[PDB]
Amino acid sequence: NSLALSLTADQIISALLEAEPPILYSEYDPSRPFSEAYMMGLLTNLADRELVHMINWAKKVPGFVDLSLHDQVHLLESAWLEILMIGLVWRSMDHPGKLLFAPDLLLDREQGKSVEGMVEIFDMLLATSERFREMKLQREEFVCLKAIILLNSGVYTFLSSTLKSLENKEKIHRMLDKITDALIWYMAKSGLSLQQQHQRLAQLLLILSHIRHMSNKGMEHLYSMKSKNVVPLSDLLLEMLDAHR
Amino acid sequence: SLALSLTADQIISALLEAEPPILYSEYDPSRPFSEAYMMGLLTNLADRELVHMINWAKKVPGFVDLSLHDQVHLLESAWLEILMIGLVWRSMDHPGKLLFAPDLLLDREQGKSVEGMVEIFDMLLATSERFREMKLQREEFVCLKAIILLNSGVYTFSTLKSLENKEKIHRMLDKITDALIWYMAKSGLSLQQQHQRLAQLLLILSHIRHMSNKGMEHLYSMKSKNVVPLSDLLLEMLDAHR
Amino acid sequence: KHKILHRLLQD
Amino acid sequence: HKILHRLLQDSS
Ligand SMILES: C[C@]12CC[C@@H]3c4ccc(O)cc4CC[C@H]3[C@@H]1CC[C@@H]2O
Ligand SMILES: C[C@]12CC[C@@H]3c4ccc(O)cc4CC[C@H]3[C@@H]1CC[C@@H]2O
Ligand SMILES: [Cl-]
Ligand code: NA
């Protein structure tokens, strides 16, 4: 219907590549006692600054700004931690055994043990990065996956009680199909057979189930750190966390 | 392995034949639904379904070729997702209701008998509606349930044995993808419709994972408040999600 | 309409 | 040992 829904696969991929957010630095100082509070402060301060850039990125995802503001809010509230995590895993592919939170903050699982309950999450994130490495995930595939997360994660909770809200839901589903088309087009241009294309599409989308799982566990962890007053959290982070109850 | 040499038709046939029975609840309609009674009925049903789920898993091609440790871990990861996808499937013919069992068909107002449950009921009802919108077929359902079993626990955390089993799992996941596509092609979908539907179905699995995590938190809350006693099996399946 | 996220998305 | 492990050893 719209200009966004008419884009070709090449146009979609090109737009998503151009929308990529900047890589931000942490505050890490080797002179500081690497305490639970210090590490959590680094991670949440970084997450808060990344969220502002994530909002700008989302507005560049084709069709996203054609949704109502309430729908845009809903999708970002649902997806934000999944998006931070897939970004982290992507940045970490080139560093076996480490998570590149930022160029100055590369942590291994033993460092993750500095925060109660964190090493289990680190291990899941490390396993996902290893999977990306095994698959030789490409940037074009990564950006498609991130756009799929944004559009899919809140879409089952999307209300369609009116003919307009039903229109919005249909637009989201049509755009999800177009991003699938773009992923397949990229794989086909890369020389994969049809069988390999479908197998790889499935492999990539199954990773999204793991990213959802890790986000759920991370949200529980962040709530725990909030409750225990381990770390002060920004107003925006507090609201994003609150949207998950 | 013999499993990795099966054709797409053989894989779908095997999975259809392995389908577990539909069990009845212990519901006594002489009694009203308190929080404790409803939780007792649902966990008693889950416990009895788990035995049949273990039987079913042993029939998923290649599963019994894995180490018992890997079989344990995969089922520990996936069990509630598997119960939930089965529930949604059973409920497709009952808009607005969840067919936990043929004698326990519940609406969201009945879900309110348990604190925190209606939120999960609503997600499951929305998933049933999605299944109806997609006209999900039994062949697609059984492929998705087998994918959950093999995938949910595959990325939890160096030994060579860990790599050998993981490679077997990935090969069989690819075979199930092949089978799903084959079923769609046989059903007349165009090549573009095939990849679009494949993606639509696999994205359901992200929502099923989400619902399982919320359900696992809920079950732990019920346990932690001494609402319902859980079987030793359920206590251990729940504790694996510590 | 009062959420921070709502405000940021209008910029 | 754990119940699930024991049940996975029965046949079928
Ligand atoms: C949310 C947590 C703090 C912020 C962390 C972060 C911070 C920045 C980032 O780019 C990714 C992630 C993913 C892991 C997140 C953590 C998982 C649990 C912890 O509370
Ligand atoms: C796990 C719960 C009890 C068992 C329930 C069940 C029980 C049997 C079944 O076939 C499916 C489900 C899904 C929802 C589950 C519930 C979600 C929260 C509650 O604690
Ligand atoms: Cl910055
Ligand atoms: Na900044």
Numbering used by the authors:
A (entry chain B): 304 to 548
B (entry chain A): 305 to 461, 464 to 548
C (entry chain D): 686 to 696
D (entry chain C): 687 to 698
What do the authors of the reporting publication say about this deposited model?
Human estrogen receptor alpha (hERα) belongs to the family of nuclear receptors (NRs). While agonist binding promotes the interaction of the LBD with coregulatory proteins, such as for example the interaction of hERα with the steroid receptor coactivator-2 (SRC-2) protein, binding of antagonists leads to a rearrangement of so-called helix 12 (H12), and this rearrangement precludes any further interaction with coregulators. Here, we show that the application of PROSS server algorithms to the ligand-binding domain of human estrogen receptor alpha (hERα) enabled the development of variant ERPRS* that comprises 24 amino acid substitutions and exhibits multiple improved characteristics. Crystal structures reveal several salient features, i.e. the introduction of a tyrosine corner in a helix-loop-helix segment and the formation of a novel surface salt bridge network possibly explaining the enhanced thermal stability.
Two additional variants, i.e. ERPRS*(+) and ERPRS*(−), were produced to facilitate protein crystallization and structural studies. These variants are identical to ERPRS*, but contain one or two additional AA exchanges that have been shown to improve the crystallization behavior of hERα when crystallized with small molecule agonists (in case of ERPRS*(+)) or antagonists (ERPRS*(−)). Structures of ERPRS*(+) were determined in complex with the coactivator peptide SRC-2 and two different agonist ligands, namely either in presence of the ligand estradiol or the phytohormone genistein, and refined to resolutions of 1.45 and 1.33 Å, respectively. No pronounced changes can be detected in the overall structures of these 12 helices-containing proteins (H1–H12) as shown by the low RMSDCα values of 0.5–0.8 Å obtained upon superposition of all equivalent Cα atoms in the compared structures. This also extends to the position and conformation of the SRC-2 peptide in the estradiol and genistein complexes. In case of the natural ligand estradiol, both proteins share nearly identical affinities (79 nM and 84 nM for ERWT* and ERPRS*, respectively). Agonist-bound ERPRS* displays a coactivator-binding affinity of 401 nM, whereas the affinity is in the low mM range in the absence of any small molecule effector (> 0.1 mM). Notably, in case of ERPRS*(+), crystals grew within hours.
